[PDB]
Amino acid sequence: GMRRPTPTVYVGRVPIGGAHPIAVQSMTNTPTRDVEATTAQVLELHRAGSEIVRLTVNDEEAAKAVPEIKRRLLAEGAEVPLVGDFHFNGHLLLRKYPKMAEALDKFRINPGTLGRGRHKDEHFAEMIRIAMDLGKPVRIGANWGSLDPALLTELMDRNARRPEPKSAHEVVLEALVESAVRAYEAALEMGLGEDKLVLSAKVSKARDLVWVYRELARRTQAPLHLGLTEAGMGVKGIVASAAALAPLLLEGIGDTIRVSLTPAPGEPRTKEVEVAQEILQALGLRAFAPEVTSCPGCGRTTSTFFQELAEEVSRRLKERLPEWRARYPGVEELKVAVMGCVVNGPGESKHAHIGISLPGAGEEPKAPVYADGKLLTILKGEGIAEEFLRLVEDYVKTRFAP
Amino acid sequence: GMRRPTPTVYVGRVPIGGAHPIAVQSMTNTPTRDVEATTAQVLELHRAGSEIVRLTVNDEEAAKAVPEIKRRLLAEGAEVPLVGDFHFNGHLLLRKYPKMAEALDKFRINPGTLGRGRHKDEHFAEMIRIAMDLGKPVRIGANWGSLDPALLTELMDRNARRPEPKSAHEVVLEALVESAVRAYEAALEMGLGEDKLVLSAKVSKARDLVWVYRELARRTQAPLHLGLTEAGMGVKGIVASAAALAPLLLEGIGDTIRVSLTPAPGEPRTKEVEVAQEILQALGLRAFAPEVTSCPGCGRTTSTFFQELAEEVSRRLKERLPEWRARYPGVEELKVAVMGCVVNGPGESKHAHIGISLPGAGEEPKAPVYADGKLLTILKGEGIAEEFLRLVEDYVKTRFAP
Ligand code: F3S
């Protein structure tokens, strides 16, 4: 359990907070001014499982496009909450384009991209005023890539007065937290409701992220948008995102997540959504699709045969999921095992809803299948793969019948 | 910090324990009887960064091959510690083939694959006796795929007597821990040294793994071999492994790790080593290679150009690493940033050793480069990529000079 309690903030129809499932979100990478490209990518992300979708609203042409994007989404019955990402000129764009402001379901403010000196407080105030006027929620999202330089100096001076000064790195982290907390407190004091404020304070190193979010969670009551910013490419990005989020999520900290992956060229923007879902599912926080538990396989089993069967099982579950979702409520929780030999095969298969254990070296050429913790059958000969997937189909029909 | 103190256990020349870096290991998936295939894969894994390599010693033909595998490894000056994985007949194989027993650098025992009833205690005793005779360390590795059924019943009965009985799942976890701890205690009582015992107790769900290892860490003083067993295939396997290990590793629990990925057909067995390394590096526990921090890119930057540059930078760092390792001590710690626009580009680049920030929408077409927290130059025109990699080469030569 352990979930941190928070007020509920609605982003469109999606509730965020301690009483609600942790929401997966993402961000487009098309130019927002391109209505056709951006609308298609919003739909793509939403269908992959992005419950909320953010898009940059960076200039006038972007802002003018947002109402039309929203129109086209509604025209296909797609109710996907949109978050506007504002930097530098957020106050100008919201002021000048009230239809954009109304079309968005949430505004993102970064307290480090408000402007210079005195201009900061006024810009912040205008954006919060507009959100208040329209009943919109706001994310106050700090990021250490854009840390308020005047706040850092204030905190550097406080640090230098300590009997034992902390390192420069630690003060940067202090400043990042203080940036978010101060603006949070300022928005509340201005009259913005607790039901309209989400916070983030992102850094790009996992152990720093854990420190930051523990402070945010202690010092505020807001729902928290959690992510490891600038996680990077490929396996590194995936691992770093999972490693940063897991300790916090297991502690009950975090109400919505975004995975900040750099796509490989040609790689679809949906990869980040898949990774976000896998993180939540790995930790038992949500269930999105059936999952396969499979052993690595070693010298006790024939590698090609074992690897191909596991891959075939995973492919079939993926093909059947759209249909299963529609017919079989709760099927998201399905656990299937594919195992290499007698060492752990039966035992792991018995912990799954349904599982197969192949014969390894020195074993009779037969493959026991277990369901609900006991022997269902034993398969042999050709077509082991097809016969098993039929049994999984049969199992699903019965277990997850309405 | 926070590292759990433990005695040091040497596996060949590799020390495991609280005073030592967390060791990456892996396991072969070739038939051990195939000397040529297994020797080549041991070398492959070792060169990828597997500091210790495990291989199954499942039958007589496997056991006879082990001395020859070791001979061939030494013949190329490869000092890679070998762990023998024993199940069911470990006592027979070690007794009958003393040259295999001597060729291994560690024996793995699973207290759930010893045999039936009375036969368990005697088989365990003989294997520990042989390890003691030869001065070998042992891993007592429990796995919930092979949980001792008699111990589970004992613990189920204890549970049923409680005022508030726990769930069956929780008792399985209790039994898994008790399996490892009891055998640990039995080996110590038999005379096996604290410098010769490593423990594991693996499960396939992340939140259960965290519970288990917190108990093991509290109830024992041994170094701990940490892994999420049967993690599975592709992105799911990677994410689940990272998510399970990170909370424990951040708490200071764990002295060596193995990532239990199911390879895709054709996919090299080294992928698990890469993932293990990325987990440790993501958490700042070890450094294996230069890493790139890159933003996801959004509508503020041109997607193809940004993604290609980031990919090109990552490819070049990978190509240069063998040479850099040899010439530039400490280069493993290098942090390079590749960023999409002015929002977080400069700030993140300034936290890296060296970083480039591309021009996004509405910006002048120039790309500032930062090193050691300040502006180094500004690039423009064609060949931005090549000019940046030259600057990174120059930076590395200076920063990491002997
Ligand atoms: S890694 Fe090896 S021990 Fe058997 S169940 Fe898996 S084949």
Ligand code: F3S
């Ligand atoms: S995601 Fe967008 S805000 Fe700029 S630095 Fe990265 S391009």
